[PDB]
Amino acid sequence: GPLKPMTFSIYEGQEPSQIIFQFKANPPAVTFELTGETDNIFVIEREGLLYYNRALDRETRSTHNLQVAALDANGIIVEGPVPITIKVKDINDNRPTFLQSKYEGSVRQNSRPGKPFLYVNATDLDDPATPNGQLYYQIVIQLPMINNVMYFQINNKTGAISLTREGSQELNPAKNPSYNLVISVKDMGGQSENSFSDTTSVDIIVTE
Amino acid sequence: GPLKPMTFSIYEGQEPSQIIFQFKANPPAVTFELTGETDNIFVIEREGLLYYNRALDRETRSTHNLQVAALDANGIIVEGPVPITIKVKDINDNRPTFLQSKYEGSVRQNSRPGKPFLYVNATDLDDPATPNGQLYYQIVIQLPMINNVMYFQINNKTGAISLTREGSQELNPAKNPSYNLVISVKDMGGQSENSFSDTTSVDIIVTE
Ligand SMILES: [Ca+2]
Ligand SMILES: [Ca+2]
Ligand SMILES: [Ca+2]
Ligand SMILES: [Ca+2]
Ligand SMILES: [Ca+2]
Ligand SMILES: [Ca+2]
Ligand code: NA
């Protein structure tokens, strides 16, 4: 039918195994012209076969804005150009990376439970609107630890470290002036399958 | 385009708010048929509208293996069937449960510290490779307790109960012949936020 705007969604990181679309020339159109963000990847054959020639990369270009025009036997545009939008669908091909391998923090004796005093942070180049770039932070270990009582907690979404109820009650620089936490981060929103992880080390001084 | 295998990942425990996918019939296809693990949940409209009509439950079915076929006006399959995979993403919707509500054990006086003599165990129906099913064991209280000294300890990952150094030094059937421990188990790795818990009771006789 008439040439019109179209959107195609194509996963990145996959070498092409299927065409995108076969356009059919409406006489007096005989050939097609593809322009825009083709990047030596998107091709239209003379008689309308639109395809891609190699794996896409959302982290290089997340949308290819293309245009297609239909031309007559004299090379005159008779339909379009119209916008053809390629949405590059994300895969989990980037690992989360803590921005420091060691954090130095401090907390006041009697800091209110749940009040952040330190943020750890990781970046993930995947799409944060998808599981692939959605990070989940956790405390792997606290040292020292007495009778399995955690004195620290982390906001699993934000990386905010705060005292627990019991940490607020028990932390005392006279008894134990420093704690080490090992923190993990994983992508896939903390789900198991196809996830990547990183760790960092946090030393926390307890002050008056 | 042509029917091909597709995977969708959907969280359990949420009322559906969006369709899954609209299949568009390419002539001579006119309608679609859905088969497989539909479970009075997954439906396709003739026209192509694939949706789910009630919350999923990973603990009932963790992957729905569906198939979609395109039928012509005479009900001949002209495309597919192709596998449509629904991966059900886990939420923390199950409380961990101890396998016994009461444990009875014993420990010999002058037993070595840190050597397990009793395992408590809980199970959690959520995914154990996620925080939702990741368990953390603690002693809530030991009675009797002498001068604020713990005589017992528990491994927070394994549920292994052993004597402390002080317990090994002080246990004596003539002075205190029995102890009770209340043990907790928590999921989310033991953090307070978004976690569920159970408790059990452990009676321990001190022997000669
Ligand atoms: Ca990529
Ligand atoms: Ca990632
Ligand atoms: Ca990616
Ligand atoms: Ca469930
Ligand atoms: Ca659980
Ligand atoms: Ca669950
Ligand atoms: Na205490």
Residue numbers in the entry:
A (entry chain A), B (entry chain B): 29 to 236
Task: Give the exact sentences the study uses for this entry.
Liver intestine (LI)-cadherin is a member of the cadherin superfamily, which encompasses a group of Ca2+-dependent cell-adhesion proteins. Human liver intestine–cadherin (LI-cadherin) is a nonclassical cadherin composed of an ectodomain consisting of seven extracellular cadherin (EC) repeats, a single transmembrane domain, and a short cytoplasmic domain.
Another unique characteristic in the region surrounding the calcium-free linker was the existence of an α-helix at the bottom of EC2.
